[PDB]
Ligand binder design. Structure first.
Ligand code: HEM
Ligand SMILES: CC1(C)[C@@H]2CC[C@@]1(C)C(=O)C2
Ligand SMILES: [C-]#N
Length: 408
């Protein structure tokens, strides 16, 4: 049974669309495909759904880009749907607007800037090689459970100086953040609250131990960046370290599954990467354009008209990032990966002040993964008749990716 809310007075009937972000119509065919069903040639730039507590959805790339770039009009004070979950959410600095956001972002950038990420290339490569060597000779693997859920997790836990045995409990918390359980807004709110608390409980002793610490790990490094001349307060630190884990341990995992399903079905595209290593390197950003996974929100700061649509203060707008990179008004033949595509503009990492702090790390993980994968398993396919299973929410997920190849 689907929970519906009645539309508020300012939402006209002709803009209503029954879209469930947590269980999209057509999701069994794929997450991207399911969002693309929403983006029809004449569909309005903003539509309103009665599901998930009632909210807007931006349906075109130009709006998505603009909203992310405009924090004075579209605040991060709520970035999740339903509102109850968004109000429970306590991660830093994603809940902050400038100027409060800026010193926390500066602190994160001390650890995640491109020059720092470059130093990690060899470590990341070693991890990828070790995992791939476990199955390359075998001729098959279930890519989700044996690679995509393993590689980024080992990379990030190593970088954060945390034990690998914590991966399972952290993954469970992350799943309830990005796809909270429940069939009511209030239930999903409670699920998010519990997961967010679980994170805080995990990180609290780590913060206490690493304040003023001598560790070289990512957490010590970022934690000990001063905020306005003083140590970061406890409340902010909890949200900050939690966010690092949430993003670092999960988002790339999901991206890799979608990417690899496509590649498994497009041997010609894989062959291009194998034959031209620079095409692989220069083509990674096209993969980010094509396999967006985040759909999050902003809070309308003031009553306004935006793209011909009346919005009220407090309205939530969901931003399905896939609808920028895959917008046929921005990219011709948007569902094909064209490694030589010159314009790859997308909002896979969002835009504006919150534009993904981990984006250099994401790009490097994917680049290293492809290089080491193709070196050891040059050709591969999805098992005949296999059906991946898809999940939609604030971050998309996919499982059951059985690959097969002739060992080289
Ligand atoms: C495929 C990989 C990734 C994707 C698609 C992605 C996507 C995003 C998006 C869309 C945002 C903006 C959220 C918003 O403000 O509404 C974001 C922010 C962020 N991401 Fe990522 N991310 C990825 C990887 C990573 C990694 C590996 C990390 C490592 C910790 C990370 C850390 C962060 C942080 C700290 C923010 C908040 C930045 C701020 O608020 O200033 N991300 N990410
Ligand atoms: C939606 C996000 C991708 C963004 C960074 C990590 C994430 C899960 C958040 O909680 C904010
Ligand atoms: C970002 N996750």
């Amino acid at each position: 049974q689907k929970h519906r809310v009645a539309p508020p007075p300012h939402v006209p009937g002709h803009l209503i669309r029954e879209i469930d972000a947590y269980d999209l119509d057509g999701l069994e065919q794929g997450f991207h495909e399911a969002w693309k069903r929403v983006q029809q040639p004449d569909t309005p730039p903003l539509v309103w759904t009665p599901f998930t507590g009632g909210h807007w959805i931006a349906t075109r790339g130009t709006l998505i880009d603009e909203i992310y770039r405009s924090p004075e009009r579209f605040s991060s004070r709520v970035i999740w749907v339903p509102r109850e979950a968004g109000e429970a959410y306590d991660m830093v600095p994603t809940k902050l607007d400038p100027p409060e956001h800026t010193p926390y972002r500066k602190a994160i950038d001390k650890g995640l800037n491109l020059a720092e990420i470059r130093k990690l290339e060899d470590q990341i490569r070693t991890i990828a090689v070790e995992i791939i060597e476990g199955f390359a000779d075998r001729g098959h693997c279930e890519f989700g459970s044996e690679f995509s859920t393993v590689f980024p997790v080992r990379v990030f836990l190593a970088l954060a100086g945390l034990p690998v045995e914590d991966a399972t409990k952290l993954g469970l918390l992350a799943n309830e953040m990005t796809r909270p359980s429940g069939n009511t807004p209030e239930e999903q709110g409670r699920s998010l609250e519990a997961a967010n608390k679980g994170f805080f409980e995990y990180v609290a002793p780590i913060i206490a131990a690493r304040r003023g610490g001598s560790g070289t790990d990512l957490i010590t490094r970022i934690l000990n960046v001063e905020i306005d001349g003083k140590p970061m307060p406890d409340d902010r630190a909890l949200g900050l370290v939690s966010l690092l884990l949430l993003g670092g341990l999960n988002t790339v995992v999901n991206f890799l599954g979608f990417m690899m399903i496509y590649l498994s079905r497009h041997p010609e595209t894989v062959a291009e990467m194998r034959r031209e290593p620079l095409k692989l390197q220069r083509g990674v950003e096209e993969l980010f354009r094509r396999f967006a996974v985040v759909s999050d929100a902003r809070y309308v700061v003031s009553d306004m008209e935006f793209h011909g649509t009346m919005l009220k203060e407090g309205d939530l707008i969901l931003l399905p990032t896939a609808l920028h990179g895959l917008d046929d008004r921005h990219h011709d033949d948007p569902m094909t990966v064209d490694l030589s595509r010159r314009d790859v503009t997308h909002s896979t990492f969002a835009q504006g002040p919150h534009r993904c702090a981990g984006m250099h790390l994401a790009r490097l993980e994917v680049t290293v993964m492809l290089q080491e994968w193709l070196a050891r398993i040059p050709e591969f396919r999805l098992k005949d008749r296999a059906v991946p299973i898809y999940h939609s929410g604030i971050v998309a997920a996919v499982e059951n990716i059985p690959l097969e190849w002739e060992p080289q």
